[PDB]
Amino acid sequence: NLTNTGNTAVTSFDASAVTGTGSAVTFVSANTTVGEVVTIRGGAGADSLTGSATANDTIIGGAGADTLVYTGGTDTFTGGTGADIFDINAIGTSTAFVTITDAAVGDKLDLVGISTNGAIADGAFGAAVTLGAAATLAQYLDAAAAGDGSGTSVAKWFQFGGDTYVVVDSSAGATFVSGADAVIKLTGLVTLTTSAFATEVLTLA
Amino acid sequence: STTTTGAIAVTGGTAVTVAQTAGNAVNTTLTQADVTVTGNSSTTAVTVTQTAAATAGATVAGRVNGAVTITDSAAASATTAGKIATVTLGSFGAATIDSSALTTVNLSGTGTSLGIGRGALTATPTANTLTLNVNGLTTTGAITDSEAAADDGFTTINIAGSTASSTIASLVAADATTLNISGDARVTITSHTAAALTGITVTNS
Ligand SMILES: [Ca+2]
Ligand SMILES: [Ca+2]
Ligand SMILES: [Ca+2]
Ligand SMILES: [Ca+2]
Ligand SMILES: [Ca+2]
Ligand SMILES: [Ca+2]
Ligand SMILES: [Ca+2]
Ligand SMILES: [Ca+2]
Ligand SMILES: [Ca+2]
């Protein structure tokens, strides 16, 4: 567990070679260079890797129960093998958002930090939003955020262009507003039909 | 006897159970024992059963219930964790719990009032889900979230009614947001006082 405060030149953290059941690595980037490429690599342990709001973090856990934290910007997450938790603590934009490359059965998606108004669903909330043969990503977003999230934030999801997306609606109108509504990309078609919301924590089934 | 059951006090232990009974005659009233449990920092669970209250009749054995007072070690602390997670009651007079680690309360039989306080921890609590499993419960008066009023109560209350009807005369939860009534047998709440509620959701059979 490495305290990293004030080490702001760091653009590559590579703990990938580390080895035990639980040789657990903790790291938090102190980088504040706007628009930086930062690479964070975990090891065999149950690692805890946090990026920077400033940065386009590529975060990769190894084996084991990794926690990858989103803070802002265009981030690329890969928890390798094991029950990884993708802890989403920022809203992002419509362009600067987190892509999770390898979301699979067992991995979790912790949305506690985007419950702007209240606290998410809590059900098994799992019928995909379906739109027309030529609906745009913009359209699918607007469709997903159609409801009222002013008093209570809601989760929805869809599949566009070969990738899977999750949304948090925290707004009035049927516009997905870049500011307070949130999108999360997941590489590939992953069916979240049967998957359930723990507290505000989605466990993939 | 008809003469009343004298105190019961416990201090410490990994788990505590105090099981009173009353076996008085058919036209008498025995009033049962006041119970106090005070956990040490190993105390995960407490259970306090009594015989059900009844009105002294021609062929009805009369029982009044004893007050129960449950307290965790770290109840008065600003920083120390707290260990009492589950509390089970089976009938009760004026009951109290005080634990910052409390998540589950199991209720049962004939009650007067339950007051739930959480430890005087100054840190803002993150997990705020009261699970409240009921089964054959009837209340004279109020289940209150004493912590919600001037401090940080439970945001989401879950009530799971089970194998028998339950009736809560009053439920007072001033910080409550979601209320989900689930399970197996009727839950009746004669009167709630939960001004900040944004949704109520019955899933019960
Ligand atoms: Ca790892
Ligand atoms: Ca980032
Ligand atoms: Ca992993
Ligand atoms: Ca994984
Ligand atoms: Ca979080
Ligand atoms: Ca909306
Ligand atoms: Ca208190
Ligand atoms: Ca407090
Ligand atoms: Ca409050």
From Swiss-Prot, chain B:
Q: What else is known?
A: The calcium binding of this protein may mediate surface attachment by ionic bridging between the S-layer and a specific membrane-associated oligosaccharide.
Q: Where is the signal peptide?
A: none
Domain of life (superkingdom)? Bacteria
Localisation per UniProt entry? Secreted, Cell wall, S-layer
* Residues included from the entire protein: 412 to 616 of 1026
Organism lineage reads as: Bacteria, Pseudomonadati, Pseudomonadota, Alphaproteobacteria, Caulobacterales
Task: List the protein's name.
Answer: S-layer protein
Report the protein's function: The S-layer is a paracrystalline mono-layered assembly of proteins which coats the surface of bacteria. Probably acts as a physical barrier to parasites and lytic enzymes.
* Record organism: Caulobacter vibrioides (strain ATCC 19089 / CIP 103742 / CB 15) (Caulobacter crescentus)
